[PDB]
């Protein structure tokens, strides 16, 4: 019952066409799921990481981006510094 969706993350001249799916019991991928994937891939904490989609700011952690308008072929921008604790 994985709700897969294709997003194009771009940051620091590095781009990935991730096929992410909802994992935390949600019917659709959400900010928590995307933040978890970003933290697993890179490790930027949710406090200072900046995800940008269509010029819309990500401030609410519980706002579903699938309802906000992410579809296949959409691209998002990741802003931050790769932290290696």
């Amino acid at each position: 019952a994985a709700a897969g969706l294709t997003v194009t993350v771009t940051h620091s001249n590095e781009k990935h066409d991730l096929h992410v799916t909802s994992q935390q019991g949600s019917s659709e991928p959400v900010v928590q799921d995307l933040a978890q994937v970003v933290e697993e891939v890179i490790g930027v904490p949710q406090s200072f990481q900046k995800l940008i989609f269509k010029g819309k700011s990500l401030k609410e952690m519980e706002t579903p981006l699938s309802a906000l308008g992410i579809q296949d072929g959409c691209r998002v921008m990741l802003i931050g510094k790769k932290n290696s604790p």
Partner: protein, 290 residues
């Protein structure tokens, strides 16, 4: 930027090359091929073989020389020390000069300006936000990071922080003619708490965003803001940006300017005689109308 549908063939490449995404990569690649990549120090440009403002000018020319490159360790490694050593009002321009170094470098510029975004001084923060707008200026992006990055600063109460974001959005959305950007910056134009020069910068941003578009609501807001502002405080030294926005919005059109000047006829002579002439010449630019 031409806004179209994906039904056309190879649409992803067409919008990318229209967005100048590969502009920066090709420009750096050719610069390396010419071997013209070494960051030219402002000092040996000055030929010093034989001061706060002078140091600021040195920082600005360094950003001018290294513009569109993104390769300058002078403001990157010890940049924080330089702005800390800098005095008074120049930290905003130094950070904006750093954005000039990183202009058209969306991916590289945003990461190297994110650290300076959380700076302590308001001028450094405003300069960092202006640096972001310079970075995204000209080059178009699919997700348009400038709009989301400048969210609280677009209408922020602090004058300097609002000035940097507004100028950054103006440079970013310059020629985009985006309805969302216009519907978010024009309400900022309608703010009364902002200073006279802040209102002028908003008019400058609106003018460069809607250049050559005859945006009716932009002109109505410009005229309404002029009417609401008192004439005595209008005509001092900073209202000269409102006619500039009008001229940009009607750039290269002509003829219809009679309506704008007729509506502007109510203004008193010292500023009306300046505003009507500016909008007329900007609209009739590149026409040979002797």
């Amino acid at each position: 930027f031409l806004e179209l549908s994906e039904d056309v063939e190879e649409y992803e490449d067409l919008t990318e090359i229209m967005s100048n995404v590969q502009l920066n990569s090709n420009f750096l690649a050719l610069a390396r091929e010419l071997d013209i990549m070494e960051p030219k120090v402002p000092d040996d440009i000055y030929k010093t073989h034989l001061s706060a403002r002078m140091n600021l000018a040195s920082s600005f020319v360094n950003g001018f020389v290294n513009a569109a490159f993104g390769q300058d360790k002078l403001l990157t490694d010890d940049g924080n020390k330089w702005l800390y050593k800098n005095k008074d009002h120049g930290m905003l321009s130094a950070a904006a000069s750093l954005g000039m170094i990183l202009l058209w470098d969306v991916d590289g510029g945003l990461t190297q300006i994110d650290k300076y975004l959380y700076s302590s001084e308001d001028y450094i923060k405003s300069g960092a936000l202006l640096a972001c707008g310079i970075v995204n200026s000209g080059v178009r992006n699919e997700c348009d990071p400038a709009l989301a990055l400048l969210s609280d600063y677009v209408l922020h109460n602090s004058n300097t922080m609002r000035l940097g974001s507004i100028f950054g959005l103006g440079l970013a959305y310059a020629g985009s003619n985006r309805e969302d950007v216009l519907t978010l910056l024009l309400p900022v134009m309608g703010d009364s708490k902002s200073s006279m020069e802040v209102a002028g910068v908003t008019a400058l941003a609106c003018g460069m965003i809607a250049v050559g578009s005859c945006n009716g609501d932009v002109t109505s807001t410009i005229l309404q803001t002029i009417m609401e502002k008192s004439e005595t405080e209008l005509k001092d030294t900073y209202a000269r940006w409102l006619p500039l926005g009008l001229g940009l919005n009607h750039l290269g059109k002509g003829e219809a300017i009679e309506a704008i000047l007729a509506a502007l006829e109510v203004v008193s002579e010292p500023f009306r005689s300046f505003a009507n002439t500016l909008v007329d010449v900007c609209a009739y630019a590149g026409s040979g109308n002797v």
